[PDB]
Amino acid sequence: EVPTSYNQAVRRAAPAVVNVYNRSLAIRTLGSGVIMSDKGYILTNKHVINDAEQIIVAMQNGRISEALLVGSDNLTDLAVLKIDATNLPVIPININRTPHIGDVVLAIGNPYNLGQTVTQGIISATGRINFLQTDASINQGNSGGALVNTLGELMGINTLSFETPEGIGFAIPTALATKVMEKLIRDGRVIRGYIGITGEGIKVKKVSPDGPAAQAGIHVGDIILNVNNKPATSVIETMDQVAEVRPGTTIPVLLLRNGQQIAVQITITELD
Amino acid sequence: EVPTSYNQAVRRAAPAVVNVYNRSLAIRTLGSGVIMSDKGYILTNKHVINDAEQIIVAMQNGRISEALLVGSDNLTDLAVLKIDATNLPVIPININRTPHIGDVVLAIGNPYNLGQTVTQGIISATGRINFLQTDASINQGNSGGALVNTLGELMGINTLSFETPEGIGFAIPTALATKVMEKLIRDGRVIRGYIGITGEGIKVKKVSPDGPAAQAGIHVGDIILNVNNKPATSVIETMDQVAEVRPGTTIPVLLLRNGQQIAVQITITELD
């Protein structure tokens, strides 16, 4: 008796989704952003704001503001902007809502600078490399905008679209995005731990010179066994681990060097 | 317990959506149409029927009829056809239903001459230049067909689809489409008012020769202030206004000509 509609989601979330314009000596590129906090913090993708000399944020209520850059993270392609904090709409965030495959979602952004657009699809996959996959159509200009469920709750920040493939696009999920945002607000960057190692236990195909591995006693050909008390079998898994250790933290490692077992103290520096 | 389906919408609306074939000395192009009235009036897009020597309408019940052209409008890309009025299904129209962003919609038409197809998406934007935007997939052959909500009510007439962009397509909304239809039925064309002016108050970059501006006392460089008692600041806004005035209507205008204020009577002719 009533038409099926996700307009309530749109009314809840779209006022917090902004149009982001990267200007330099006119518009160099453009995209979208999401108002995360009533203090004026906005998430967007780093590739939207790269090389900006001036960052303009336009709200759907027609307010236009200049933005400051709080910080950015190349590894997640996120950036935080800050605008004047008066009477801002904020995106709905439900910290208890896990994105499930098949959840209906809406992507909200500014594809082709047509003005704010809302497209619909579902959560197609999760865990993709930390990505959500979706077939809500995402186009150039959508980057940095919101993927929301039918309650308007933020599911992720839309980032990129994959014969021409159809209906394959990706978003950084909310939990990760918000964690990156908080680190950027606090530290002005995402502090990750670094070890100077390229690998495929794990073989050190290459040590990094000036790399806490080399300057620790580690050399090529080794097999690392334990990294800070944890077996080190998979590279992504082990690099994810190392990322987590604070810099200036002094960890034990365990290596095999020609059929013997030498524990190594390496001290974690900050990744560049 | 029951599968989710919009089949009721399809059962209500698809019998009124036709396949339109533009023939000349075999098929030159094809598209779709919508039966608007039980008297046999059909909306389609003008680009579907341009240069037709014969217009064939096929209904989903297998009836095939030849159509007459009632009229067409280049500015909205609409045309009205007329077929024999026996026992026709008519599209549902709810004059009170406003299309809202996020409303689920179905596009019904004949993409690639595959036979009648129904695709699903949402209302993505409204007000686009008077367009609805949708991510219900629209392809070549869909032009002229129906965009309906999940009750089967007509939301608009599908017109065109915008790396390859995905999920961006446009429809003329029902209220506008029906207004154009009524004018075409009544007058055989859409009568618009015309003033001979190109502008960007508003500067007259160019007067049109034989243009009621020039033949009224208006000249290049002027700034027009008021058009028929209304400030004239924006061009689209002011051209939309002029369009509305009936031809042979004699309106006051107000211009600035070198720091003085001369009221001008211009008489509105019909646009070609």
Add this chain to the structure above:
Amino acid sequence: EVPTSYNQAVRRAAPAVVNVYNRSLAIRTLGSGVIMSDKGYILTNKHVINDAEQIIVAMQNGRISEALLVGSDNLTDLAVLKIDATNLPVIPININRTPHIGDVVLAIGNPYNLGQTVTQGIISATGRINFLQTDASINQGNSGGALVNTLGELMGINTLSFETPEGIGFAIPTALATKVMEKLIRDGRVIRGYIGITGEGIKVKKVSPDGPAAQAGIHVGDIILNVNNKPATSVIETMDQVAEVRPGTTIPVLLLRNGQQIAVQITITELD
């Protein structure tokens, strides 16, 4: 109050949708498959497994198995695989569920070897040449996977995707797919009847040499009237009929040969 989701369908059906890898002397091509029976029978598309030297099936629970080929059918592009039958999830099948235009559907498969993906759309058309059409996005890798409704019931086996067309993709409907599967299990192929005739009653533009028509007394130019007691007007209709007759079945036919009516006994062989 609850987000709209088709996750229940995904939880019911996706565990039975597999990733299929065609290996030869590394991966030659890949796609998807559907577990049809707890005995280990899997449907996929023939084009996925063509020329395979080894067929690997990966389940979403991480089990990896080698598959045997039960048989395949070029005309429907289907194949049946067999894996070890321990504790398999099976796709939901409702023999009473007819696919209706507008039914919401989910396509489940392995596009671009991203890992199992679920996309959403509707049933766009049925009866297409026996195909379902859908705008659930289908990409390279989806072939052989499941199209399910929102209860998780199998609607069809996804086969191929049709300016770039958007949202046009095809699946073999469940009833047909299951019938082909049963014939492949039973006979190792789909046994069809054959008559040696190319036509457009029906004119025999070409007889097939060694073709039960020619070796029956039939010749070019004839008009066939009745095929086994049924008027023979349409070619698809009449070829569909002939397909149904078992080989070694001896049927009457009726032909016109220059204004006279000669009944012909032809004996149906098996198509190659």
